[PDB]
Design a protein around this ligand. Structure first.
Ligand SMILES: [Zn+2]
Ligand SMILES: [Zn+2]
Ligand SMILES: [Zn+2]
Ligand SMILES: [Zn+2]
Lengths: 397, 397
């Protein structure tokens, strides 16, 4: 009944997510608590040509016991060898699947001073891997399934057996081949429009919002299926409903107010609000967790500037459920969003000529949603003429 | 009650098996079906200084689905990157724990032609790792716990819930830091004795036995904790109760009769009996499976010669249980044993000068026990003077 779906999901993760070519290895990252799924995938991975399914499970309880028992000035250790190896594997042609779905409240009750000291070191070794993935070298994807740290957070509906029972079902909607085939087309179309009109800036307007997000010079809109070395499709993110590009470093004046909460690694930031001036967020605030957010955005200069503008129709699947998934992948594609920090260089058509064309450079990349069911969006040309792009959250084309 | 043991086991695996030094990473190999244990270990790993517990789970069902669905001429793939990485990690100082306990009958019902084609490739990439471990560079160990492929094979006692219930308990005997600390000393002592007295041969005598196992020239007795690149302890085998060295290729005259059965890869060889002449087993026989044993020992010349003499007091733990574990590791350390085939070169103090000093060379290494509760053992010098070593199975020192 539902097992017939779970299958399709998995089946899909491969024939579409990775578009796995016969005789291609498949390294996969996943949570030690979803083995049963891994296998389900593997099976389908191999049924498609996969020559080797290697999975590296990541247990949180393992790290949980680390932070609480490991010696300080000792956490600075990282699985360098592993990661640096995964890189090689990637560059040599190995595909990269990755199951996502973590429990935000796993590191709860633990000194945040340390947790950082540990992750700041992890990312330090993982870097060469990330690069291999950020810069599409191999075909990678990200499928997600339940987790008693999700069904337990999305729905606070006692039944854990049943929370998953619900959540597992939400994913069967948010995630067929013939609907996805006509979805990547429906995207590449908007992505074609937005690139051709060659706007000068977008203008969000709604309850409490009024932002003029300028756009970078020779900017370039991304969205949907990506090209893998020459001509080869593959949907990196499974939920994917967004379209985006880099705004302009110094051209975003206005006031913009949050729509959906922002799960910033455990702590919950709600009702956030920011005021922009000549591209700089001169005033960031929030009903809850103001302290935390302000710190992250005080990292460097670029911290308080924008590096990504994204349009997500609020009539989409992840949106119809109307829930908080405290997960980037899921929330990011929930509703139109804006993001502070570094702008993916994959958005500037075509180091120093970057900061000139309008690219923003920083350490952090925070995405918070602002799009909603009452968010109207127009697109302006350099002269001021404005073409309607979105209304009450829906596309007008 | 028993959880108080499981703890000690785990606790021990670290304070004695690895002798883990503070701030040392701990890579660990283990079966996806014994997570609960891994954690138990991890906890203790970190409670001891461990700065990072990284585990790589190995699921058999995963490989099971590979062989049966993966394309042929495609299995030749190996987790090169992973293994080659584990190597680096080892050479750089990372300890290496490894949980063992596999189900022999997991690859049952599958074409052996392929299974080989896959493992022959695995060992090909793993090699550099093995080398790092074979040649003690870091402190490594091997702890073992139940598995429904063991408790289901050791005891064919329906209750799987209870098979483990038994097996888990067998291990608590065969395998606590303060008892192991005074056990490795109690060994290194015998190992010191046996090396100093510099015998010319041992003489086993008992019911049906009368063998004069000469000893190799400049032989060297091994036993207990090993040295890892310079000065670093680590107990490779967890049950370990033996002490041994290489006999002399051409100097073992006598008649020796089996005490305990010999599990030779599935087939059960019982009551075996062999007659030696000038070092050659001129007559090997057995109540059951004679056919099988004779073949294995007819591989080459060295096949029917000895390459290891070991002394195991029959008043030991694995012995007090009085069971057949149809596992080398467990049986080998059950009671004094002798072994046909290749002699570990780690036993000759200090290629051609090997076959001269008395080293035996061959393809097979079969260990069958002969020691028992009524096995008296004396040790002879080159002149004939004999010093009593063991009586009724116990040491006399
Ligand atoms: Zn985005
Ligand atoms: Zn983003
Ligand atoms: Zn032995
Ligand atoms: Zn042996």
């Amino acid at each position: 009944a539902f097992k017939r779906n779970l299958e399709k999901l998995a089946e899909l993760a491969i024939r579409v997510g990775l578009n796995l070519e016969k005789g291609q290895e498949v390294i996969a990252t996943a949570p030690i608590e979803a083995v049963d799924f891994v296998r389900l995938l593997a099976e389908k991975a191999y049924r498609e040509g996969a020559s080797l399914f290697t999975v590296i499970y990541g247990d949180q309880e393992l790290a949980r016991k680390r932070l609480a028992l490991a010696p300080e000035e000792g956490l600075d250790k990282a699985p360098a060898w592993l990661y640096e190896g995964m890189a090689r594997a990637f560059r040599e042609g190995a595909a990269r699947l990755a199951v996502s779905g973590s429990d935000p409240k796993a590191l709860e009750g633990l000194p945040p001073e340390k947790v950082g000291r540990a992750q700041k070191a992890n990312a330090r070794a993982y870097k060469p891997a990330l690069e291999a993935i950020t810069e599409f070298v191999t075909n990678w994807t990200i499928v997600p399934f339940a987790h008693p740290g999700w069904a337990r957070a999305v729905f606070p509906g006692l039944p854990e057996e049943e929370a998953v029972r619900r959540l597992w079902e939400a994913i069967f909607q948010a995630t067929p081949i013939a609907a996805w085939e006509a979805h990547n087309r429906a995207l590449h179309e908007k992505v074609a429009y937005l690139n051709a009109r060659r706007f000068h800036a977008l203008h969000f307007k709604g309850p409490g919002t009024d932002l003029v997000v300028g756009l970078a010079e020779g900017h370039l809109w991304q969205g949907g299926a990506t090209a893998t070395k020459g001509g080869r499709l593959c949907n990196p993110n499974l939920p994917t409903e967004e379209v985006f590009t880099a705004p302009h470093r110094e051209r975003v004046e206005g006031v913009v107010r949050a729509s959906r909460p922002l799960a910033l690694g455990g702590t919950l930031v709600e009702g956030i609000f920011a005021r922009f001036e000549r591209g700089f967020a001169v005033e960031v605030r929030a009903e809850k967790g103001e302290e935390v957010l302000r710190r992250l955005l005080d990292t460097d200069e670029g911290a308080r500037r924008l590096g990504e503008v994204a349009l997500v129709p609020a009539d989409n699947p992840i949106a119809k459920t109307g829930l908080v998934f405290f997960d980037t992948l899921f929330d990011e594609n929930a509703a139109s969003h804006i993001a502070f920090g570094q702008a993916y260089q994959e958005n500037l058509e075509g180091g120093e000529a970057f900061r000139k064309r309008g690219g923003n450079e920083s350490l952090v990349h925070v995405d918070w949603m602002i799009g909603s069911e009452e968010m109207d969006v127009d697109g302006l040309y350099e002269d001021g003429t404005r073409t309607p792009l979105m209304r009450r959250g829906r596309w007008v084309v």
